[PDB]
Amino acid sequence: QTQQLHAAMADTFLEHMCRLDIDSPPITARNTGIICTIGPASRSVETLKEMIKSGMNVARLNFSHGTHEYHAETIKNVRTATESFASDPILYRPVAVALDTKGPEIRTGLIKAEVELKKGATLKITLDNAYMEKCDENILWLDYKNICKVVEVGSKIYVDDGLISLQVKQKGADFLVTEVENGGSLGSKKGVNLPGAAVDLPAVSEKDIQDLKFGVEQDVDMVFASFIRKASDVHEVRKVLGEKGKNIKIISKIENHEGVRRFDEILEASDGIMVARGDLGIEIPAEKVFLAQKMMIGRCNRAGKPVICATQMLESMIKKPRPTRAEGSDVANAVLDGADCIMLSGETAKGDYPLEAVRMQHLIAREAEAAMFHRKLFEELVRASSHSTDLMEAMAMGSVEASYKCLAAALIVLTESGRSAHQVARYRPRAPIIAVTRNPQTARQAHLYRGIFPVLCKDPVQEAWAEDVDLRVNFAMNVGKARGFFKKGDVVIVLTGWRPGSGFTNTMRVVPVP
Amino acid sequence: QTQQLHAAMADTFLEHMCRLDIDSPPITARNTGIICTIGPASRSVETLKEMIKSGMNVARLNFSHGTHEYHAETIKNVRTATESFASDPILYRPVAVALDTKGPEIRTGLIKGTAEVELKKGATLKITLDNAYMEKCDENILWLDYKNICKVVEVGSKIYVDDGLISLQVKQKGADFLVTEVENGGSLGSKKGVNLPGAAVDLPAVSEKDIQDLKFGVEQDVDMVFASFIRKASDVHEVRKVLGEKGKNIKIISKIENHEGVRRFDEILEASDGIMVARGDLGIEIPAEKVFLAQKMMIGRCNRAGKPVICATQMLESMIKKPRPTRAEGSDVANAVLDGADCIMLSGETAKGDYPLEAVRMQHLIAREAEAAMFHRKLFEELVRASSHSTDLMEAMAMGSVEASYKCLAAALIVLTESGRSAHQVARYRPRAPIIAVTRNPQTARQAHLYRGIFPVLCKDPVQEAWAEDVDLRVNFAMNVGKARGFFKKGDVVIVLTGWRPGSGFTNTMRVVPVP
Amino acid sequence: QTQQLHAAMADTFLEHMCRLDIDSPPITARNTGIICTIGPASRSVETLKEMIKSGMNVARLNFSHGTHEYHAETIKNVRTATESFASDPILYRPVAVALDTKGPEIRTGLIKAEVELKKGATLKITLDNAYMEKCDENILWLDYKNICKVVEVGSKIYVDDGLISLQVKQKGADFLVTEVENGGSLGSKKGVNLPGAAVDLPAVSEKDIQDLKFGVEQDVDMVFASFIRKASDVHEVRKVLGEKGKNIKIISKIENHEGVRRFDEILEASDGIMVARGDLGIEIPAEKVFLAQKMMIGRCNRAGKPVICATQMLESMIKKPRPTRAEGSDVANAVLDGADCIMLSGETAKGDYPLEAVRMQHLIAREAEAAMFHRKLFEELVRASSHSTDLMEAMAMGSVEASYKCLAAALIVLTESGRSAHQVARYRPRAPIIAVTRNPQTARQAHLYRGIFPVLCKDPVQEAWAEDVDLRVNFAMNVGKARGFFKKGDVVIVLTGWRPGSGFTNTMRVVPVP
């Protein structure tokens, strides 16, 4: 049987596992969005074309590095690589452009060769600007000007992926005599974390403002805002984006202990959430990170808002053509948990194997997608939002229940603002959601939701609403036919608008593929 | 609330996720077993004493390498480090010794004296069986152990070298030679693993060498055998036969490493004492993506059957060179225990790694954070559902006790067991509270580490004449253990499972008692 | 298969029904308690002996009728009929004696032949005491002195089982001109109900006080207090019973709209509850009574306190040897809902067929008992009290789960105060609960709980606690053996006390029948 449909009939989660067949092939569609950070390894147009073919949906731009000239060239190269498919809009794949803010991060200065720090040695950290290019095994410089007024005596300091640990012995004006717990080699510009400390740095600094404002004029689809701790942080980001960029989605990166506590207010203020395991792993104990990841993914699915699982999902692929078995189960678990999107950061930025990692997330994703207990998950998603008496949610729940029953090949949704297709997605159909649109911005943003395959209609608006409905539908039929989701003789569910002035998608049809 | 007790009241699995609290601190005890494979980095008594403190439960011995003298020394070192704690039985931790067979593994020869040859894309690589090339492997020529390779391999067939990192496609065939094309390159070192998917290798599951290693384990008195590349139930029976009368108590963990192992899992499972999900070799015979499907399939089925399932291979791989794991490795351990893994394994992290102690510490840290994050109530109901066609008396005692421990939030379940059968049965229904299994039998104590939740304590005290006093003694011994380990203080509630009389056959009496 | 054990394996309530086999014979045990009101038809010792044989557990005495000489003779006849079995304590069945209070009921006077009242006629109700023996189609007398200050103009008055309806046209000092809605024949002493009115009569009148105090010196086991509306009502009943009769159980009859609203405070104040469908059916609309019945039975099972379903369960058996099909499904539904006890009132008081009705409730009960989805009900009962971290509840849940698994023949409980066996019962084992005791009062009260078969041990207390445990157990083994619950080779669960000073029953044993 296809798509683990035998394991679908389980009624017990234990019995659901026991039935999972490796001989059971998945469907050709792949619901989980792949987000790739474009660095030196993947920056060229020749490479960026290949990534879209390999399964790239959203291109991330990290603004912790590079200039504004630099990233503008990257965003230009994305669009060039994307439009080189627009000649035939059937096969065309919308590709979103994402901007990730730097955030209030703490970094180091330059070395006078990577400096070795021995276990149980004496170190001193001075904030003097004459030590910007003079760092070794005794002297070090940091960005955080007001570090002394927040750091206490006997506090742990983590430098560079939390691999180097320090403990403060002496406190001063701007000097800190620190004792090394576990050392190692030390390069330049290495990140610094402070777990158990109240970082009073701005949520959005003047650099972040200009990073965001650059995103508005460059026409970015979404933003990954860094180190969010409360609601006022998200509001400021929206305040910076203003009326010009109100439609730009705000995905909120949860990277610290405070962001986990106050997740409820951050999620309602945001369009999406990012589980930043990387930084989170240093900020909270590394073995608690899986707890929060499931806590956040659970509530984002429950709220009907996008969630991205990020960082180190395929690390070993920076230097190897194959991932580890730990990296393989993690990517699967991320989608089994319910995450809408999976992010690659570093494997696609610097790695020797950019393509392999994207193809790998694509192969793992659609295996785990079928491995989900849909019917049992659907009931829980209904239960969780049973207070809501929304009309579109009713249209969505009905369409998904019908897609489970007749084992439909897809769900065709005619959406303009995207809001209708998003609702179908939050109730997780097993089949893909072909969401036809004529709004470019809507098409690109649609990748943030599990299941939605967006297609931009490049045909003119018909006079009669029925013909304009019928022409968009056959288009979506042609997309599934061409991409191979279905064929004539198969069955699909179609969500349209009854008349031009219907707010949401209010008409459901069970129709065979023509 | 303490140990995710808020997420335990969820009634919905989605609600259960949404209720997980990072500030909800777990209990002291750690239920999931930790298997460490002992190599150069961990072989010293001094290092071995530290790992026992760090929470090593089993010591795995990889018989793919080393002479019989070498492993006999590893064994001696492990038992010495274990006996170092035998001065105080209350604190004493019994560590298991596991023998891992070489099995039918295909490996390359040695490279010429770059030191490691570079294979390039599209390049040609000749494979030879001529023993003159045993150590003369280079970019043009390669040697393999499997003298019969060309009888099982065809034109177009894929050959994988060194943990599936180097891919070869057969272009010319011969009697004792192969001409292949490199599909994707990499550096080629000495004595590397070779995999042949789709091919049906006619190598023995138990070879002449395997017998010598298994006969060695019997006299060395190993506690379990990790049987490599088991493909069918007739493979298990041959290991069982080799162990024979003298090795009858040695448990057989069957390693599932190929497509045939998975297909015929049902017959392998009921024939084996336990199963190991050998992710490494498994993820080369079948597509790497399909591996999590096999893992979950195997864990579930073993949990349903009440046999130990071990998760193995590349769990904390980055901890070989780095003192902190990657994020994918962190969640991998967690999800393995959240799946229902009786035990978790470390291969390279403790054998060759720079940070063996940190690797045993991280697994111990993740594991108990995941044991509380489980959805116990729902799992219990489903395990009960699955086994309802059985009406075994011991199974009921186990179900009553675990139900009882959920209600009064018991701190521990004390079990008096001679063969382990009773403790194993309580463990299979997966209580939240640790299971303290008092045993006078040393080998029973060591093998008990295979099962989730069982904290084996060896009693050195003599047999009392009156059964009632003998029972109390062993319970009192168990009580002090909880106090000393910090599992529970005075006032706390435990479940005590005992035999009513010497000829009970199982732990037929259950009591709820407060700690004195 | 026995006992609907195929339907036991369902996992779906729908699939649970579909599997119910009429060819599936129940076990010999019968968990549901049968309560019988002893009137003229059943008053004689010769008849009362037969009722115990037929399945009588609790004898109800209605104090709305008769004198104190009268009921003392009934209670004397019960004990005589009971003790005539005590020669062999193995086969002996404890029989409880119950006292039901009159309550603040409103009745009529005497007729000057039953008076016919025509539909749409003129009537006048006067409170003058010279009309006590003078009633007809125009004049009527009532008990309620302050009726005018609570009755409004255009209010409905129901007289005699709510079969005669009236509507007030004129209000006065003590005269009420009422219009007949639907009439009929009218006898003497007929009850009167006032739905939608605030009856300010005492909860316990001086008659009720002397009814209760008579119960104390006569040594009654429980009390069915009438027309309870709040917590102060139950407290007054306990206040009247005092220290002399503190161990006498207070079962609270819910008969009015107010008692349904304030059920939560009444249940916690009471030992038990009685669903008085009869009076309730007039006080609230007759078609809403099934709602409340399930509401009360649900919460009583959830609270772990006894609930009795009462009145008109087998009405047609007053004049016929066979009940109706409506009466047959109702008795079954009462036990399927979860009621601990089922009451006969009028079928056993006046009926031409006292024995047949008791045997009929016994036959229906143990059929419906097996028809319950135990495993699914057990999980819900655990879920409902999952906040409670009680030790005895833990002992109970463990013992019941073990009785489900090995399909045990019974649960042997060594209880003195009864409290231990009651806890096993609240979690509903499928097998009977043989609860051994040496407290007569405890044995009799134990019938108020589904499953408990109480046996009074008439053997002397042994010196060694183990021998005193072992001698009570073999006794309980002999009871099940004799009564036919089990045989040697079968398996049972045994709940004992580890040492003499263990508060609850703390030791569980799976032991084969010797």
Ligand SMILES: [K+]
């Ligand atoms: K960043």
Ligand SMILES: [K+]
């Ligand atoms: K091996």
Ligand SMILES: [K+]
């Ligand atoms: K009454």
Ligand SMILES: [Mg+2]
């Ligand atoms: Mg970050």
Ligand SMILES: [Mg+2]
């Ligand atoms: Mg292997």
Ligand SMILES: [Mg+2]
């Ligand atoms: Mg009444």
